[PDB]
DNA sequence: ATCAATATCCACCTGCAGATACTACCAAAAGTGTATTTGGAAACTGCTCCATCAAAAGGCATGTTCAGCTGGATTCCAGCTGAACATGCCTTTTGATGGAGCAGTTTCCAAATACACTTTTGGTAGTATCTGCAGGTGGATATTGAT
DNA sequence: ATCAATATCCACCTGCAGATACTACCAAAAGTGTATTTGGAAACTGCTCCATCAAAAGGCATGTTCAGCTGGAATCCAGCTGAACATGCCTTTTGATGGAGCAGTTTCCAAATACACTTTTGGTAGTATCTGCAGGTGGATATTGAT
């Protein structure tokens, strides 16, 4: 069956995320709203990561590329180098 | 009559379950598909370290969970117990992620 | 030959902290005291977290500190939580917390 | 092949000093490494700006101290300052 | 028969007035006393450049104005038109000033 | 030979109409009575944190005079960058 | 006759000064000759962008002298300058006129 | 005693103002803002370029580092034009002497 | 109150992935010793500007009265979203397998640094003189609210 | 719709704060030229680890039904909060003075850089042994929701 990739981020997985966030009841429109927010996040972080990749003249996005990008965006991540 | 839990009971059960654990909650492969698709828009024929993709999923899931907490506070502020796009939007606005 | 760490009473590497400072382009010069002080501050902060994380491991009846324990240690401590407020710990999860109005009855 | 430095074995030393019978997983060791690297960068960075603001070319223990006061919350700053002063004192005498 | 504008009319007039201008809204000398009192509690025998106090007042007024904006959105979210302390608290929580 | 009078309770110099005006510039139409004391508390926290950092810069330079730059540097690190007084 | 590096680059902004500030700033051990040129050009371009928009705001306010208010109007009304300076306070700049619709009478 | 020289970007900001708005002036407080702006953006780009060079074990900040820093730091159209203006200035600079 | 249906917890057990303890190897890095350079503390002091003074006055804070209309409580009900169950679809596992490409090594030259010398310039400093617009007045237009 | 009270607009003007203009001065800055050093690009390549492949295995996502209960709409009203007024206080303004302390300049040594050499160490690679605990079991018992 034909399938968009962002639609691969399924309703039940979004549900579990909300539950860890302490959310008890979810509106039907939340699931499309969440996917849109997810996409912007990834776009912003991946754009910065790939930019580090290009500068290093590589073809492989490294964990460090991602880590540096997250730090830029004020989303510092522990556990993957640096 | 067959057994049936009241609405909200099982929801509360899930909250306790996932707030106790630390495993990722999005399927690995669909997430990996999404990452490569988005990356392809910035540069073609890219490869990814496995740790790179995992770093992305960790940061992204930690972000959505945090956002959902703030969303929940907004819903409760309006005397609701159901989160709505209205609530996500307010949280992101106040966070400075937009408008 | 006695290492500067030994000479200062530290487990953390003074010589390395010094090399990292001057190769880091933080300034033209680096005083001899600076890497000692900094190595000391880093060791102490490491000790404070490992202490609290160890206790978290004990409470869960474990003997090996895992990421989850580091998270519990930090988020349950007012000052460590503030210092690391914009940091996410991989495989750390969140604190058990449910808004009161969501509880039944 | 080349080598990659980390704080791992120094982290482990400090671990056995505070919890002799406690171990630490490699994933958790990665986090401690990130922690030490992060705080180093923060403190060094702030000390750098301090020296520059005052038209100084040297970063001394004085810059490190003010940087720590600026960066760490109340009690953490107090103890860190004390630990720092203690180590520089015992380094002058020894 | 003496003239009265309805409740809300003058308030809207005032919004338009102050969103149009840029001058400081807190009295100058009282703010200066506040700064000296707070600074003194931290360190005795301090002196202030006049521009230093003004820098503090520009920062404080810009901070508060921005906070009232976010506060207003929280109140409207609750279907109110009146800002309340819980609105300020919600805004500061999401901002990460108390979280 | 002298010392200035005791400085106390100056937070009340942040008057209700002053707080009303700031709310107006912030687009606020209607204000509950408890807002004014809440605002004073919030302002005091903000001012303390900035002044603490500014004075810290002052002492490090071995001065007795808080400069505009001390404040600007303090604001910069608190994530409240300010144009118009500085470097 | 000597030529400035600025004139050699076709720039109004000072290349020599920018080069000095890079070395004096402890950003790296070495600084290439192309680096201050590129940086001076970017700084100049951004200055031109803001002054353009601020000059328009001044004109719309029937003024010929740009004041901080005009700089603020130009920045907050431009989506990209607003993003770039989103964590910046312009002294004596005030805010944009903006009243939430639900507040208006009806 | 002569008070030390306080450098600013004023005379350059003023030049660009005249290119852009020939009949428009600028107050000293507004010029103060402009000076804060240039210094801020200088520091952001330089700082980002510094990190960039350090991540890649390079001891030299070249025009290449500045460009990537500008792409990382500026949004969309601003990055596009800034990069263009910067490239253009470098090629012209090197095509001389 | 009883009582049935699940969920949840505790004690114990066992396989294994990941922690560990070991010996050996070595390049880099840290310690040592010596000669050289220099940053910035001291001392001294010129001079900006901060604290404090007085005095007059009107902009604005305070405190009160009055009632418009907002917030909060109550009720009520349509329909949305949770729970449960039945499918079946594709994520996961892992194991092997090219080979892309990260990364280590060698070569070497364009470009950077160091330095001495010459010239240009941007920043006070001292006065001297325009000029944009703040703030005042007056009178025509618009807005708001009662009726 | 009419009309009256009041805010709002805009033209016109005047005083002046602040911007513009000029000359003089000059220390630092910027450029030029020569000699010397070396960062890192280029080319080749070995070895890591990434992409893909098959292929069950089944765990988990999807579609559906049903109804519990939440969200939102409607209604009411006590009292909070806005508007307006009277009163007069304290902030604002203008200007002067003394001197605290910031800052400019010069002297001078403790400490830091720069090499050369020696020694220690931390990262490493196999190689073998060890173990904390995830995951599975049973059965006690707590929770939930029907009566
Ligand atoms: Mn006090
Ligand atoms: Mn010197
Ligand atoms: Mn009434
Ligand atoms: Mn209402
Ligand atoms: Mn190849
Ligand atoms: Mn000149
Ligand atoms: Mn006017
Ligand atoms: Mn080389
Ligand atoms: Mn029903
Ligand atoms: Mn309800
Ligand atoms: Mn009074
Ligand atoms: Mn004195
Ligand atoms: Mn060893
Ligand atoms: Mn278990």
Author numbering:
A (entry chain B): 21 to 102
B (entry chain A), E (entry chain E): 37 to 135
C (entry chain G): 14 to 118
D (entry chain H): 31 to 124
F (entry chain F): 16 to 102
G (entry chain C): 13 to 118
H (entry chain D): 29 to 125
Passage from the reporting paper:
We analyzed the biochemical characteristics of the reconstituted H4-acetylated NCPs, and solved the crystal structure of the H4-K5/K8/K12/K16-tetra-acetylated NCP at 2.4 Å resolution, for comparison with the unmodified NCP. The crystal structures of the H4-tetra-acetylated and unmodified NCPs were refined at 2.4 Å  and 2.2 Å resolutions, respectively, by molecular replacement as described in the Materials and Methods. The structure of the NCP with the K5/K8/K12/K16-tetra-acetylated H4 is fundamentally the same as that of the unmodified NCP. In the H4-tetra-acetylated NCP structure, the electron density corresponding to the residues from S1 to K20 of H4 (molecule B) is missing, which is quite consistent with the previous structural analysis. The main chains from V21 to I26 and the side chains from R23 to I26 are visible in one of the H4 molecules (molecule B) of the H4-tetra-acetylated NCP. As for the other H4 molecule (molecule F), residues S1–A15 and S1–K16 are disordered and residues K16ac–I26 and R17–I26 are visible in the H4-tetra-acetylated and unmodified NCPs, respectively. The electron density corresponding to the acetyl group of K16 was weak in molecule F of the H4-tetra-acetylated NCP. In particular, the position of R23 in molecule F and its hydrogen bonds to E56 of H2A and E110 of H2B, in the acidic patch of the neighboring NCP, are conserved between the H4-tetra-acetylated and unmodified NCPs. Thus, it is unambiguously concluded that intra- and inter-nucleosomal interactions exist between the DNA and residues 1–16 or 1–20 of the H4 tail, which are disordered in the crystal structures, and that the tetra-acetylation of the tail impairs these interactions.
The nucleosome core particle (NCP) is formed by wrapping the histone octamer, comprising two copies of the four core histones H2A, H2B, H3 and H4, with the superhelices of a 145–147 bp DNA duplex. The core regions of the four core histones adopt histone folds, which mainly contribute to the formation of the histone octamer structure. In contrast, the N-terminal tails of the core histones, which are rich in positively-charged lysine and arginine residues, protrude through the DNA superhelices. Furthermore, the N-terminal tail of H4 is crucial for the compact folding into chromatin fibers.
